[PDB]
């Protein structure tokens, strides 16, 4: 066959395993037949171009559908009352009741109500008409075409880059820090000053107007005279109606701090100043590394030079330059870990400090965004650790990393893993024990016997940031502190107004329930890290299989020889860490959603009192809030939440189906499929038809992967349905 053109070992397989493995190994270029390093890098480059084109097309489709089937123009008028519609529904299976139930948003045809917040985002950017969205979609289609053409072009013989170019670290770092990050944020500041702020103040600025419309009455004279403070005078009044000129100011750059009163989001002038400042900072950072001129550093020199003279790190960072530059998996792991941390930060900061107008009052949108980004963060962290393990298996060179930090990590992997296991057991034992203690005492009717620990440390941090709810009087809660006196006339007034009002999610009040769930989150993070770190460090070998690197990253097992070797691979460590990562993110999003739901309905006491025992979570969060969702459709009718109820049950179904693959293993199914093949061959009128690929049972690793995928899809879809439907049915 020539299906897996990249593997004759698969092309010559006479079973369906060929098709399955050709699917699952299509993007492992390193393992493909006759793969050279140059071809590997050039294919990755072209694939990146295609991926960027896909992203541009996806955003273009969002914009186009919101422009065509959306209600953006009538949403920009009363954004707090109009529901934003994502796209129209055309399903030939809907009944008239379903069409009527889904006809909402002020439109006259069934629609989906967006939970992505793109409406608020674009409104804040400066989009007001559907023509603006359509023009944006056109531009993104053009950009997708440009990037597809670039990907095709850079695969041509005279345009294919070389490896001396792919491994040029200094120039890439300089350009990414200065232009991709720095100048890009500077351009975003330029946009926010030329379009977003005038649009927020009711003055339309576009391509036909921006070359004649001054962003500031003084023009650029304050900039070119050094009187930069003139750009902060006359900010927007507290009675500014976003999108109109009533209450507007003339400032373009400020540091008011806090939130705009009406929109309840960060000041657009503050955002513009933020982006300008980080832009110049990044432009400066991008001039650090040496390029075709004499100035700059060399990363190899810095790494080799950095070795503490005490010798507690050995050779320090010698050889890491070559290791990282020659290992794409090391780079992939670093990038994935950093992006995962940044997306968690995006989630954590975007709910505490909303940046888009009126987004804070779109409760379902906020919960959906937070859950989305936390799940993405967990996926990225699991991927970072998996690719670290793959690097250890494939790209690690001990002789090169003779007694540097990496070799030392491998040296005391036993200590690392044992201490990680100890801290995991510590956290688990005691967190679960406190939860069970509270459960039992409350069950016996003695809630006063609960062990409720005040998160005094987090409360102290809040008070330091300026929260007066708790009496600590530390740094910014203290009016006579140096910290207060330093920023009293820049941002502290607004920041204190924001922090000390209970209208926002900025530094929500915390209690013993928060303490307990936080230590549950700590347990989850530590156990996921335990599994992933153990997989990465034992990937090359263990006492059971001291030659694992020979077998690779994702082999099934080593047989029942030494007492059993099931799940003895780093891939299997990843497979288990994915259950644990799904468990931890579930805990995190449960905590977030319940706290915010209780605050939104104003009964924060319900969380404060029921979060201390697991029956409280099971009853007052899941059981209590599942009512509208499970009533989406019922014997007496249906509403728009019927789709979410259906997806809820869909997630349950696929989750339980994944249980099949995870519990039942191959031999049973292989002996069953044998009988099935016998039956087909000896059935008249059906033996006229014959399989071209011998029907076989799924492989061990394949079954693990399929069960994991089913489990993950059930997890994600069930919680998406629950969160969105419950939020939409309660508010």
């Amino acid at each position: 066959t020539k299906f897996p053109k990249f593997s004759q070992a698969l092309a010559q397989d006479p079973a369906t395993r060929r098709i399955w493995y050709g699917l699952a190994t299509a993007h492992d270029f390193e393992s493909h037949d006759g793969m050279t390093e140059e071809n590997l890098y050039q294919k990755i480059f072209a694939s990146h171009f295609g991926h960027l084109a896909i992203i541009f097309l996806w955003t273009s489709g969002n914009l186009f559908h919101v422009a065509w089937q959306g209600n953006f123009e009538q949403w920009v008028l009363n954004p707090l009352k109009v529901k934003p519609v994502a796209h129209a529904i055309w399903d030939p299976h809907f009944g008239q009741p379903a069409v009527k139930a889904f006809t909402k948003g002020g439109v006259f045809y069934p629609v989906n109500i967006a939970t992505s917040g793109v409406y608020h985002w674009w409104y804040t950017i400066g989009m007001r008409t559907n023509n603006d969205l359509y023009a944006g979609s056109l531009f993104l289609l053009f950009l997708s075409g440009v990037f597809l053409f670039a990907g095709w072009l850079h695969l041509q013989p005279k345009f294919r880059p070389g490896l001396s170019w792919f491994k040029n670290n200094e120039s890439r770092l300089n350009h990414h820090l200065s232009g991709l990050f720095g100048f890009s944020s500077l351009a975003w500041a330029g946009h926010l000053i030329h379009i977003a702020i005038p649009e927020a103040r009711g003055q339309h600025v576009g391509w036909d107007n921006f070359t004649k419309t001054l962003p500031h009455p003084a023009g650029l004279t304050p900039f070119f005279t050094g009187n930069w403070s003139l750009y902060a005078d006359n900010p927007d009044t507290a009675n500014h109606i976003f999108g109109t000129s009533e209450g507007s100011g003339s400032a373009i750059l400020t540091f008011l701090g806090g939130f705009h009163p009406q929109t309840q989001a960060l000041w657009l002038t503050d955002i513009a100043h933020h982006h300008l400042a980080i832009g110049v900072v990044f432009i400066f950072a991008g001039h650090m590394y040496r390029t075709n001129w004499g100035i700059g550093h060399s990363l190899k020199e810095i790494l080799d030079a950095h070795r503490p003279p005490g010798g507690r790190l050995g050779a320090g960072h010698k050889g890491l330059f070559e290791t990282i530059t020659n290992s794409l998996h090391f780079q992939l792991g670093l990038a994935l870990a950093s992006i995962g941390v940044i997306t968690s930060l995006v989630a954590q900061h975007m709910y505490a400090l909303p940046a888009y107008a009126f987004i804070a009052k779109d409760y379902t949108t906020q919960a959906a965004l937070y859950t989305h980004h936390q799940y993405i963060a967990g996926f990225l962290m699991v991927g970072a650790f998996a690719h670290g393990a793959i690097f250890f298996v494939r790209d690690y060179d001990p002789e090169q990393n003779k007694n540097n930090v990496l070799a030392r990590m491998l040296e005391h992997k036993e200590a690392i893993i044992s201490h990680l296991s100890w801290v995991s057991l510590f956290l688990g034992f005691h967190t679960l024990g406190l939860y069970i203690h509270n459960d039992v005492v409350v069950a016996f009717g003695t809630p006063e016997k609960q062990i409720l620990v005040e998160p005094v440390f987090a409360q102290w941090i809040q008070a330091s940031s300026g929260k007066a709810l708790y009496g600590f009087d530390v740094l910014l809660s203290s009016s006579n502190s140096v910290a207060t006196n330093a920023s009293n006339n820049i941002w502290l007034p607004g920041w204190l107004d924001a922090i000390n009002s209970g209208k926002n999610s900025l530094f929500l009040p915390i209690g013993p329930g928060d303490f307990l769930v936080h230590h549950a989150i700590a347990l989850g993070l530590h156990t996921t890290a335990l599994i992933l770190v153990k997989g990465a460090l034992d990937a090359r070998g263990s006492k059971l299989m001291p030659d694992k690197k020979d077998f690779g990253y994702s082999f099934p097992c080593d047989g029942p020889g030494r007492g059993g070797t099931c799940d003895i691979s780093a891939w299997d460590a990843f497979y288990l860490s994915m259950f644990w990562m799904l468990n931890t993110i579930g805990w995190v999003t449960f905590y977030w959603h319940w706290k915010h739901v209780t605050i939104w309905q104003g009964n924060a006491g319900q969380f404060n009192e029921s979060s201390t025992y697991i029956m409280g979570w099971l009853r007052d969060y899941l059981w209590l809030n599942s009512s509208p969702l499970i009533n989406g459709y019922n014997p007496f009718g249906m509403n728009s939440l019927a789709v979410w109820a259906w997806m809820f049950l869909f997630g349950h179904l696929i989750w339980a189906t994944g249980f099949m693959f995870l519990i039942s293993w191959r031999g049973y199914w292989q002996e069953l499929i044998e009988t099935l093949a016998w039956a087909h061959e000896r059935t008249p009128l059906a033996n006229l038809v014959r399989w071209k690929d011998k029907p076989v049972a799924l492989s061990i690793v394949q079954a693990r992967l399929v069960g994991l995928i089913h489990f993950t899809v059930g997890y994600v879809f069930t919680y998406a349905a629950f969160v969105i439907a419950s939020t939409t049915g309660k508010f």
């Binding site: 294919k43 694939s47 065509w68 559907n130 023509n131 979609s137 056109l138 597809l148 053409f149 095709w152």
Partner: peptide
């Protein structure tokens, strides 16, 4: 508010992008 001519221009750009995507897919498959 979005006219059929606007939608047709969008479709033409989408078709151009599809042609380029097929070209890139071929080049990558090689």
């Amino acid at each position: 508010m979005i006219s059929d001519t606007q939608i047709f221009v969008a479709l033409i750009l989408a078709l151009v992008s599809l042609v380029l995507a097929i070209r890139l897919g071929t080049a990558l498959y090689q």
